[PDB]
Design an enzyme around this catalytic site. Structure first.
Site, PDB file in Angstrom:
ATOM      1  N   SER B 198      43.924 -29.033 -60.292  1.00 40.68           N
ATOM      2  CA  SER B 198      44.116 -28.539 -58.923  1.00 40.68           C
ATOM      3  C   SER B 198      45.571 -28.581 -58.486  1.00 40.68           C
ATOM      4  O   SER B 198      45.913 -27.991 -57.462  1.00 40.68           O
ATOM      5  CB  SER B 198      43.332 -29.318 -57.881  1.00 40.68           C
ATOM      6  OG  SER B 198      43.502 -30.706 -58.023  1.00 40.68           O
ATOM      7  N   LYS B 241      41.486 -33.865 -48.467  1.00 39.45           N
ATOM      8  CA  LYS B 241      42.805 -33.317 -48.642  1.00 39.45           C
ATOM      9  C   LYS B 241      43.356 -32.939 -47.290  1.00 39.45           C
ATOM     10  O   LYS B 241      44.520 -33.211 -46.993  1.00 39.45           O
ATOM     11  CB  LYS B 241      42.762 -32.124 -49.570  1.00 39.45           C
ATOM     12  CG  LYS B 241      42.481 -32.465 -50.988  1.00 39.45           C
ATOM     13  CD  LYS B 241      42.818 -31.269 -51.852  1.00 39.45           C
ATOM     14  CE  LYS B 241      42.093 -31.266 -53.159  1.00 39.45           C
ATOM     15  NZ  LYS B 241      42.249 -29.958 -53.797  1.00 39.45           N
TER      16      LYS B 241
END
Ligand SMILES: Nc1ncnc2c1ncn2[C@@H]1O[C@H](COP(=O)(O)OP(=O)(O)O)[C@@H](O)[C@H]1O
Ligand SMILES: Nc1ncnc2c1ncn2[C@@H]1O[C@H](COP(=O)(O)OP(=O)(O)O)[C@@H](O)[C@H]1O
Lengths: 243, 291, 145, 48, 49
Positions: B198, B241
């Site tokens: 990611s 996140k």
């Protein structure tokens, strides 16, 4: 009867828990069943020595003014105001919210900083009894919890001996060198220590040698480790890490 | 269960935490008031962790010092004030969240869904040899990844590298910085392996920043997953996140279009003050960062 | 010197930072990109603090690079970022007392640790002359010129 | 333990049944992620 | 004549219904059913006491 009677006048003085009183009553019934000369009579008579020897309710009283703690720490340890203020807050808060209260604590730093020296200085500050107990590198579970008492040569774990020696029910135990305790497959004492250090389950601790539950709730344990990182997380997370 | 927003911790700690520790020191509110202002300063500065455990240590410390001020100290009723506070809990440690601020070229922010919470780890790169080793020189500008790579992160890195090499000739053929020079690149550890790839969308933007040498636009955090042909791919764990990006003061953010769903599940107060830019093909992002 | 793997990444980070600082600073030298170098870190640091030594490392190589000796008795510590930003290190008080024991009369720390250093007893702080810093370039002008 | 082993006592759960006195308590296994999965007889297999 | 034993094996993507058919066979033939997982085990004594 002789030994039963000396331990029984003992029993009359130290205020044993009634549960442990009746448990030693049935055990004494068995001692009456047991022979006068048998080697097992020797193991169980010296068991009676280890059990009756333990104070059961002797309660060293503390000073509770911070001032006398001021002096007595100053009597034997200069400077280090951070650790003194910490102990001062410790006494100041326990002194506020009524009864004595437990907590575990650790000091750590280069060897010979006075760690054990302040331990004993606090022990004579609070008036609690002192007892060192190193555990650096220990592995066997017979020195912490004891033996079963049915093994040949069996003896109770170290704690039973500290209670036998210090004569108070509420001493200041000082386990030493916790960081390097042997955590093996052979029965990990470091896991076994949680029963000591559990705030609620210390109150009914029991060990294989002498089955009867002990009541450690009044003890003020202390533990010493040179570095806080190596200690396993479940043990490390409870106690405060003073430096 | 998820983490907690910076403001959210205030409403927690004033009710469910402060009284509990007050019962641990045995005091009552009558003598040891703690205003909201002390709490917001605490959580905003001295504790940047998704859990509430760290603030729990601080407030403990403050209370117990108050207990010492009562039973023996001077005041019969300690009154913490922010000006007072530095006495009790000492001087501030952290303040300057997000170390770089000018972000000198070739460093870019990147979100990471670490094993606990989320953290805004930076990614950095730099030259490792003189660039003009030969004006005629034809040697591949070999990369050197670093920062506790798992091998899977290594293939992701090489893929992103090749896409960078292609994008330059697609954009500005005259430049040749990438193919003709060695480059060290450093990804800080912390991301759990499954999300490892990611970070990759950050990587390519790092390299390009180094290529033209122009700085990235300030505080434009990003994340994604690159496809070797400019398609971007969904990433996981978005709620952590986004909160980590919120703590660091980020004021823009870029996500794969495939996660336009999950981000909107979030409570509306959590999402205020951000300005998202969903994108799918990589070329899009290039126009929302540099120019 | 009984390297931990973390020392291997730290070493390459510091190495590349040296190679960039030379080319940005003194192009005429080419010692680093054109020569092998042995480097030895004596053991004793525990692995968790391992990176804190790294800021020393780059100045070692630079002394070899220009070839001038470093300014005398200048102990330091820190943590390098691969682009010249510096980071806080932990446990400063033990370090500073050890530096006091050694007769050190200057020291350099990341500015982020300006907090903990003031906890120290005043007698400890007499006679020193500290230099807090953030970007690495500062240190370069406080050793050589 | 087998109860023929020296020092045997029933596993922790039984202590919970003796203490909690209900047939239907709320056991709370903690920190499953760090369960010791070793060669020495994997408890995690035993928990299934 | 008599009843007979036999081995068989099934294989395919997880969640296709394998185990589910097992019990249906058990009530078809009328034999008793008994699951026995063996995934990841290594103590042969467990298979043999
Ligand atoms: N502030 C101090 N006051 C008194 N003695 C100290 C002090 N600091 C260090 N010491 C000395 O350090 C020694 C270390 O002893 P101790 O703490 O008992 O065990 P440890 O070696 O584990 O630290 C003692 O002899 C003690 O007198
Ligand atoms: N053809 C089918 N008819 C009915 N149920 C099915 C069918 N295929 C799958 N299932 C369902 O799939 C589930 C799991 O199937 P099974 O093989 O028993 O376990 P697994 O699929 O995990 O091996 C069962 O609960 C079952 O109802």
């Amino acid at each position: 009867d002789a030994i039963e009677e000396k331990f029984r006048e003992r029993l009359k003085e130290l205020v044993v828990p009634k549960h442990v009183m009746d448990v030693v009553d049935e055990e004494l019934s068995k001692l009456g069943l047991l022979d006068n000369h048998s080697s097992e009579f020797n193991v169980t008579r010296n068991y009676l020595d280890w059990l009756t020897s333990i104070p059961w309710g002797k309660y060293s009283n503390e000073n509770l003014d911070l001032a006398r703690a001021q002096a007595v720490l100053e009597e034997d340890h200069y400077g280090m105001e951070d650790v003194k203020k910490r102990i001062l807050e410790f006494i100041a808060v326990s002194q506020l919210r009524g009864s004595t209260q437990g907590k575990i604590l650790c000091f750590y730093g280069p060897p010979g900083v006075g760690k054990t020296s302040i331990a004993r200085s606090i022990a004579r500050a609070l008036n609690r009894e002192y007892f060192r107990f190193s555990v650096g590198g220990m592995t066997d579970v017979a020195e912490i919890k004891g033996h079963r008492r049915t093994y040949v040569g069996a003896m109770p774990g170290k704690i039973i001996q500290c209670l036998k020696k210090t004569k108070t029910e509420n001493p200041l135990i000082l386990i030493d060198e916790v960081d390097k305790i042997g955590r093996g497959y052979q029965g990990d004492p470091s896991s076994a220590l949680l029963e000591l250090l559990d705030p609620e389950q210390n109150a009914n601790f029991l060990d294989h040698y002498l089955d009867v539950p002990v009541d450690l709730s009044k003890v003020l344990f202390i533990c010493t480790a040179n570095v806080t990182d190596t200690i396993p997380e479940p043990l490390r997370d409870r106690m405060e890490m003073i430096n | 269960v998820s983490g907690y927003v910076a403001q959210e911790k205030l409403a927690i700690a004033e009710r469910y935490l402060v009284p509990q520790a007050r019962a641990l020191c045995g005091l009552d509110e009558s003598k040891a008031k703690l205003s909201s202002d002390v709490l917001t300063l605490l959580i905003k500065q001295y504790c940047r962790e998704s859990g509430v455990r760290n603030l729990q240590k601080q407030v403990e410390k403050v209370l117990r010092k108050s207990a010492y001020k009562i039973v023996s100290g001077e005041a019969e009723s300690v009154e913490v004030t922010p000006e007072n506070l530095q006495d009790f809990v000492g001087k501030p440690v952290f303040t300057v969240e997000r170390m770089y601020d000018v972000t000198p070229p070739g460093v870019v922010m990147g979100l990471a869904w670490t094993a606990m919470g989320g953290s805004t780890l930076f990614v950095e790169t730099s030259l490792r040899r003189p660039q003009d080793k030969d004006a005629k020189g034809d040697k591949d500008g070999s990369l050197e990844v670093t920062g506790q790579l798992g091998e899977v992160m290594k293939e992701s890195a090489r893929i992103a590298y090749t896409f960078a090499r292609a994008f330059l000739m697609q954009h500005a053929p005259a430049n040749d910085y990438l193919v003709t020079s060695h480059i060290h690149l450093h990804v800080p550890e912390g991301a759990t392996p499954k999300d490892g790839p990611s970070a990759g969308c950050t990587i390519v933007t790092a390299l390009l920043s180094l290529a033209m040498g122009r700085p990235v636009r300030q505080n434009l955090a990003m994340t994604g997953e690159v496809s070797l042909t400019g398609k971007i791919l969904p990433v996981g764990g978005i709620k952590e996140k986004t909160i980590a990006a919120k703590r660091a003061g980020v004021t823009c953010i870029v996500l794969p279009a495939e996660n336009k769903k999950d981000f909107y599940d979030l409570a509306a107060f959590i999402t205020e003050g951000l300005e998202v830019h969903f994108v799918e093909h990589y070329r899009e992002i290039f126009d929302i960062a540099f120019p």
